[PDB]
Design a protein around this ligand. Structure first.
Ligand SMILES: CCCCCCCC/C=C/CCCCCCCC(=O)O[C@H](COC(=O)CCCCCCCCCCCCCCC)COP(=O)([O-])OCC[N+](C)(C)C
Ligand SMILES: CCCCCCCC/C=C/CCCCCCCC(=O)O[C@H](COC(=O)CCCCCCCCCCCCCCC)COP(=O)([O-])OCC[N+](C)(C)C
Ligand SMILES: CCCCCCCC/C=C/CCCCCCCC(=O)O[C@H](COC(=O)CCCCCCCCCCCCCCC)COP(=O)([O-])OCC[N+](C)(C)C
Ligand SMILES: CCCCCCCC/C=C/CCCCCCCC(=O)O[C@H](COC(=O)CCCCCCCCCCCCCCC)COP(=O)([O-])OCC[N+](C)(C)C
Ligand SMILES: CC(C)CCC[C@@H](C)[C@H]1CC[C@H]2[C@@H]3CC=C4C[C@@H](O)CC[C@]4(C)[C@H]3CC[C@]12C
Ligand SMILES: CC(C)CCC[C@@H](C)[C@H]1CC[C@H]2[C@@H]3CC=C4C[C@@H](O)CC[C@]4(C)[C@H]3CC[C@]12C
Ligand SMILES: CC(C)CCC[C@@H](C)[C@H]1CC[C@H]2[C@@H]3CC=C4C[C@@H](O)CC[C@]4(C)[C@H]3CC[C@]12C
Ligand SMILES: CC(C)CCC[C@@H](C)[C@H]1CC[C@H]2[C@@H]3CC=C4C[C@@H](O)CC[C@]4(C)[C@H]3CC[C@]12C
Lengths: 597, 597
């Protein structure tokens, strides 16, 4: 049925695939992105603490399962920097670095699989419960700040491998600080051959990227920079024999064959559930952003709920077949699009490229120096570091949107990467309250010879009507701004009804300008519980000094809430609800005349 | 100067004190409230873990120092149940129950003094920084829930002393549950003589309270119930010798003489700063509520800032002279008023009554059974338990105000009393966002033969103007509700400008009803940063399909924010800001006519 085809998009979009103007483009794109996934795969695997094959596994399985369940047409899923950073934190925290290496690595990969499992389950859940609207609450400033912060950590991590130092470090509170000073202390312990192969690597990378960018096409497929750098460097470190002589650290044994089916031991569930929640939220945020970017630009739509289901299935399947959490990324996605990716056929093609390297090529990457992997990670990190361009832009336009960006970024650099995200998100939510908490109240008068009413301060043309004081709040009346409203009503109408009643009673036991306040509720989007209580109070007080309160403006839902909340018995009737300020004004004047006689 | 007289209110209100119609009333009230403070003082001291004299000290010093710095005229400050509960938690947590007794008691009273100190400093601070407006954010449902929850704990605590069991218990997560089952297990270990003196005590208390309530005045001063019950019971337990024979636990030695000046050792500052923050916030909340209640009822005003300074000075002085945190309370305050309290002279008088009992009477309360103290605490707790009457009231009117009450109460009973308060307060703040997050949007039309515009669904009379679509949100446009606004604008105007541009471009590369949207911003109280960005987007999209967007309504502050945020260059000019929907409608129609020719 339509349910089965919507819960497995492949069965809808694959039959309609036109093999003539697309298949060429998707195969080019697949080869381009596979050439990119192999080096980065292994890189991002080291950054995460796991052995190097996990990057090849994470680059093979995820993109397939997403091709099946996925709605986006330009996203490439796989191992991406920030998630790898988060997985790494948890691994090295639950398995410190202290036969021995294989024992530690076995426990490491078990922690990884638990993280992948839980992160997939959370994402799957959210998508089944149709809570995919909550990925809108993750502002773009929030996510810019968080990814830029996380790229500062990932840059500092890869300095140690790039020089050849053997520094231990942490990801805990203020860890970047003592990590950078740790590297400044140990810079005399620099391996010189490791700095050699690092700088050689960067030179070849920038040369090939600039060359294939500026120089002539003469190619259906672009020049794969990272691949050829890994290849030249592994050959150089095998011939000149860097590993054993000069002491340059190399990638270990990469085992041949398909992944082994494994089981995430949920014995570690209470240790890792917190960081699995952070992985899951980061993954959704980044992947769905990218989905939406390319969907907007190419004139189609993604479903946020089906996207959550797809990413969750991909992680859970992967958890079973020896992977770590994948996600989409704007880099691979841009590369996949610029190469001429049209469907998820490109994802399937790229995964077959990683498959043939898992199976055959395999242990030729024995003599690959870890410095060439660190250099690849630093040149990929350009993307996220160029987002510092966004702190001035936000600054100019909206300063609360610039604070979301700064709080999140500082929170991520100079505390934890989990805590950064949490504090950022909280601040993001609070900015809506700070926008609505001192709203813009006004006293309105009639423009002469027109039956429109506008602010009397801002439009000096407008004159107040005799006997009728009209006031207009331009916000919801809720818990955040309701005391304020009642204050500003008593200050801009120039009357406090309880003080006036006190003076009247004092004078009567010893022995106001207006007869009608019209509240214009055109901009009251909603009222909550405190709101209805505050409006009850205002009406009761102004009944006591003998002033009718008419509402002129109320939307349907605000009238229904006022009614449930019991606003329509204490003096006010539903016949004091008018459509526009004018209709209330007329009615007010008329009652006054008919009562004069 | 006026500063010195406002920073020491006594120097203003004391000279003007008329000695003829007031001094009698205040002396009656002072004696009534002192008769109440002695038994309760000692009671609340046991409830807090400290030795019994601390209640007499806390009943003597605080009321004096508040008389000097205080603005309220009917509040009585002193030891009150809920704060004593909180101090007790911290004491027995930092000093578990395991020569030995004096050593433990010395460390106990040191913890107490640190709490009093810090709580006074926090309250003093808040009042100097003029942050006394933040005590408005503490809803009445919040505080009803929290005090009712805390009275459940205080009732369960005093069951053990009332029967004679020797149960240990905690205040940690779900502690009420295992505390009640602990008492159900150990009910066979009931002392029978202790249950005797408990039930005797309650009988005498209810008899004397009912008697002096219903029966004839024949008295300038009411009958002090708690005092005469403590007196009869101590004499009974001395004559019949309950302590040694039948094993009834008694109050220890009450030492004679004034307090010793002490120093709160801030060596414990990092252990107790969290609970000192809870003490401080509870104290302010309760004391200032009461201040405001009696100020409203008697036709004067308190300053919230001067109240914070007064309560903080009182706690800091007291911390030095061997006290534990005091606060106002509605019970003593009601007793002080009903007796005929007119000024803080009543507080000074009551403190002299406690002074003469500290000095002289003193160790006659050796043979006082602790069961008579527990019974006094249970009959005083009536006050706070009758607030369960507030959960149905809130239920009827506002269900979000009923949730604030329930979340806080359940949070306090079935988790910690600190955590209850925190969760309650958070929920309280979030309810304002939930009120304003799906506001009431409308499309407005002109009432025929009137120049007022109101909802076309709710007022079927109103007709839309040709060419002009008028929409009105009734809320702030901030982070919480801004995506919603833009959705409902495209749904109720029946046009999506980006889809319309896409269709137009598709048709043009192969080869809407209106010309003007008027947003009525009369109820937009405020706009925040996300708000200005969302309004930029709407205007830019509707410029692209060739529809002018006019704003008709905006208050001063919303126009200034739109201007800073850069809203007034991307198509919109400040001449598209009108006063009322009518003036915009006229201008819209007119432009359309003048362009037809
Ligand atoms: C993605 C990254 C982030 C991670 C995700 C984080 C996830 C965060 C999750 C967030 C949750 C978000 C969901 C809320 C949706 C809003 C819609 C809404 O509530 O409208 C209402 C329906 O809803 C209700 O009112 C139903 C309430 C009943 C439920 C409790 C009963 C249990 C009783 C005992 C339970 C005891 C159990 C004990 C167990 C120990 C409709 O209301 P209405 O009448 O139309 O008028 C109101 C005004 N509006 C709504 C119209 C504006
Ligand atoms: C130390 C650091 C801590 C970080 C915390 C960060 C701060 C938290 C951030 C808060 C953001 C919002 C979270 C609150 C979610 C409310 C859920 C809800 O709607 O359920 C409701 C009742 O369900 C309940 O009874 C909920 C009771 C508690 C809520 C648990 C939330 C998860 C965090 C737990 C953490 C556990 C920690 C484990 C140990 C550490 C009903 O759901 P509903 O769907 O609305 O029902 C109506 C149906 N429709 C129609 C509306 C659908
Ligand atoms: C009681 C129980 C509870 C316990 C208490 C809990 C306590 C909670 C405390 C809560 C705090 C509440 C106070 C906020 C008051 C609101 C008024 C307000 O902000 O209006 C603005 C003034 O304010 C500002 O904008 C000033 C911002 C500058 C400060 C930071 C600079 C430092 C730079 C580097 C620092 C580095 C240091 C590093 C250190 C490690 C005026 O704004 P505006 O231009 O008029 O327009 C805006 C709109 N409005 C305001 C008009 C609506
Ligand atoms: C585990 C449980 C934890 C419970 C936490 C509960 C959740 C928290 C609840 C949050 C409620 C709001 C708290 C935030 C207060 C903002 C302060 C502010 O305005 O300062 C600003 C900058 O100052 C800063 O740089 C602030 C940096 C951090 C804020 C600290 C808050 C206290 C909690 C710390 C907890 C420490 C924990 C210790 C170890 C546990 C400037 O102040 P300002 O006056 O606006 O300046 C402009 C001047 N006028 C004109 C406006 C006056
Ligand atoms: C998309 C590609 C082509 C970008 C170009 C890559 C090469 C040519 C350039 C541009 C991006 C550059 C890196 C971007 C980020 C940093 C961090 C900074 O603290 C030191 C320089 C360093 C490490 C740069 C070194 C040189 C670099 C790798
Ligand atoms: C270094 C980390 C903390 C990033 C934070 C950078 C922030 C604080 C800096 C970076 C660039 C800065 C902007 C650079 C240029 C201008 C233009 C000038 O006419 C007004 C200030 C303004 C708009 C600056 C505001 C502050 C700013 C946004
Ligand atoms: C203000 C005064 C006069 C109120 C009257 C006090 C006496 C007569 C009455 C009314 C208040 C009563 C107590 C109020 C609260 C409770 C808790 C409940 O779980 C058991 C009964 C118990 C313990 C009551 C016992 C009798 C009691 C002490
Ligand atoms: C026992 C603890 C958890 C206190 C919670 C009590 C709550 C859930 C109960 C207590 C009394 C109840 C109210 C009692 C009477 C009525 C009148 C009826 O026409 C509608 C329901 C209504 C309004 C009930 C709503 C739920 C209610 C408020």
């Amino acid at each position: 049925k339509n349910l089965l085809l919507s819960f497995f998009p492949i069965l809808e979009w694959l039959p309609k695939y036109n093999l003539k103007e697309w298949l060429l483009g998707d195969l080019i794109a697949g080869l381009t992105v596979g050439s990119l996934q192999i080096p980065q795969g292994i890189a991002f695997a080291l950054l995460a603490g796991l052995p190097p094959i996990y990057g090849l596994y994470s680059s093979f399985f995820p993109p397939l399962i997403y091709a099946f369940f996925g709605t986006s047409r330009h996203i490439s899923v796989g191992p991406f920097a920030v998630v790898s950073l988060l997985v790494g934190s948890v691994v090295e925290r639950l398995v410190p670095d202290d036969n021995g290496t294989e024992a530690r690595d076995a426990l490491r990969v078990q922690v990884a699989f638990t993280l992948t499992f839980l992160a997939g389950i959370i994402q799957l859940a959210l998508g089944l419960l149709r809570l995919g609207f909550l990925v809108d609450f993750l502002s773009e400033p929030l996510i810019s700040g968080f990814t830029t912060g996380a790229a500062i950590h990932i840059l500092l991590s890869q300095l140690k491998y790039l020089l050849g130092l053997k520094i231990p470090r942490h990801s805990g509170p203020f860890s970047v600080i003592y990590s950078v000073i740790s590297v400044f202390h140990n810079i005399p312990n620099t391996n010189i051959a490791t700095l050699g192969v690092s700088l050689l690597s960067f030179v070849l990378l920038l040369v090939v990227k600039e060359l294939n960018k500026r120089f002539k096409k003469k190619l259906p497929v672009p020049i794969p920079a990272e691949l050829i750098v890994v290849i030249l460097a592994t050959l150089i470190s095998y011939y000149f024999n860097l590993a054993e002589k000069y002491g340059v650290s190399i990638v270990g044994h990469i085992p041949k064959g398909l992944p082994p089916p494994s089981v995430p031991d949920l014995s570690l569930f209470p240790l890792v559930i917190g960081d699995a929640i952070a992985i899951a939220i980061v993954g959704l945020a980044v992947s769905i952003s990218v989905g939406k970017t390319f969907a907007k630009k190419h004139g189609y739509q993604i479903d946020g709920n089906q996207e959550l289901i797809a990413l969750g299935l991909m992680n859970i399947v992967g958890s079973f077949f020896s992977c770590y959490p994948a996600t989409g990324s704007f880099s691979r996605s841009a590369v996949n699009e610029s190469a001429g990716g049209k469907t998820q056929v490109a994802g399937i093609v790229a995964a077959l490229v990683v498959l043939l390297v898992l199976l055959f090529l395999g242990p030729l990457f024995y003599y690959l120096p870890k410095a060439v992997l660190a250099a690849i990670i630093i040149v990929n990190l350009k993307g996220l570091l160029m987002q510092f361009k966004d702190a001035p832009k936000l600054w100019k336009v909206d300063k609360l949107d610039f604070l979301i960006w700064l709080v999140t970024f500082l929170g991520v650099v100079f505390l934890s990467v989990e805590i950064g995200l949490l504090v950022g998100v909280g601040f993001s939510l609070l900015t809506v309250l700070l926008r609505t908490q001192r709203p813009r109240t006004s006293v309105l008068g009639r423009i002469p010879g027109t039956d429109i009413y506008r602010d009397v301060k801002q439009y000096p043309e407008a004159e107040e009507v005799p006997g009728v004081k009209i006031f207009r709040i331009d916000s919801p009346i809720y818990f955040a701004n309701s005391e304020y409203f009642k204050e500003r009503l008593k200050r801009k109408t120039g009357v406090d009804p309880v003080k006036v009643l006190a003076a009247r009673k004092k004078a009567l036991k010893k022995i106001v300008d207006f007869h009608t306040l019209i509240l214009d509720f055109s901009a009251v989007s909603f009222v909550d519980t405190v709101g209805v209580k505050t409006l009850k109070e205002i009406v009761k007080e102004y009944r006591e000094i003998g002033v009718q309160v008419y509402l002129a403006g109320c939307n349907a839902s605000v009238v229904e809430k006022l009614e449930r909340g019991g606003f329509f018995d204490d003096g006010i009737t539903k016949e004091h609800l008018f459509l526009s300020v004018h209709d209330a004004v007329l009615f007010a004047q008329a009652r006054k005349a008919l009562a004069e006689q």
